[PDB]
Design a protein around this ligand. Structure first.
Ligand SMILES: C[C@H]1CNCCN1c1nccc(-c2noc3c2CCC[C@@]32CCCc3sc(N)c(C#N)c32)n1
Ligand SMILES: Nc1nc2c(ncn2[C@@H]2O[C@H](COP(=O)(O)OP(=O)(O)O)[C@@H](O)[C@H]2O)c(=O)[nH]1
Ligand SMILES: [Mg+2]
Length: 169
């Protein structure tokens, strides 16, 4: 049958989680998407010749560390940890998201990709080298994206699928 991959997009508000997701789903850039909407979206894609079903949870809202929300996040098989290259705070929040993922999955080995979004913008405040070095510290890939131009979008999601596949084995 067709394998379904449950991917979860996390990161500070305003980094482009929704815009990245909608680029993948609609093949269209949105400059506006209600910041409070957390929802999941499915798409069939071919990755390495295999048609698979992506189920992408675009997270939103305030922190909630209930048992219910933990159990829900635990259903995620891989995580995109997104920051914006023009927002230092969003980069400095990455460790929080990574630590929450390690906690809820009870594993130091969770499929994950670090995503530096808004690569089309001139206002960079986070050096590429620093982001690459953080991904190296975590042992995960780093992908530079733009939801506006589509730079890196397939690479980010497809890399995460490839990481999930390898983790199963
Ligand atoms: C960076 C910090 C601290 N400073 C203030 C802003 N902030 C902040 N804001 C809003 C949200 C989140 C946040 N943290 O973890 C999470 C989020 C949202 C996505 C889901 C996730 C990550 C995946 C594993 C689990 S498991 C569980 N229960 C979670 C929750 N909720 C989470 N942090
Ligand atoms: N130029 C540019 N703007 C982006 C990009 N991704 C998101 N945005 C904008 O950043 C804002 C926040 O995006 P959104 O997807 O709502 O962020 P979220 O809170 O993480 O879901 C919106 O105005 C988006 O159009 C990107 O790659 N480039
Ligand atoms: Mg959003």
């Amino acid at each position: 049958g067709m394998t379904e991959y449950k991917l979860v997009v996390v990161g500070a508000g305003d980094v482009g989680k929704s815009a990245l997701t909608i680029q993948l789903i609609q093949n269209h850039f949105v400059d506006e998407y209600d910041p409070t909407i957390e929802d999941s979206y499915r798409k069939q894609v071919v990755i390495d010749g295999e048609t698979c079903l992506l189920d992408i949870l675009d997270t939103a809202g305030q922190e909630e560390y209930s048992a219910m929300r933990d159990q829900y996040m635990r259903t995620g098989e891989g995580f995109l940890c997104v920051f914006a290259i023009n927002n230092t705070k969003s980069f400095e929040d990455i460790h929080h998201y990574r630590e929450q993922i390690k906690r809820v999955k009870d594993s130091e080995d969770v499929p994950m990709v670090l995503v530096g979004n808004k690569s089309d913008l001139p206002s960079r405040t986070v050096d590429t080298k620093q982001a690459q070095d953080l991904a190296r510290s975590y042992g995960i890939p780093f992908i530079e994206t733009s939801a506006k131009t589509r730079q890196g979008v397939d690479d980010a999601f497809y890399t995460l699928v490839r990481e999930i596949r390898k983790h199963k084995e």
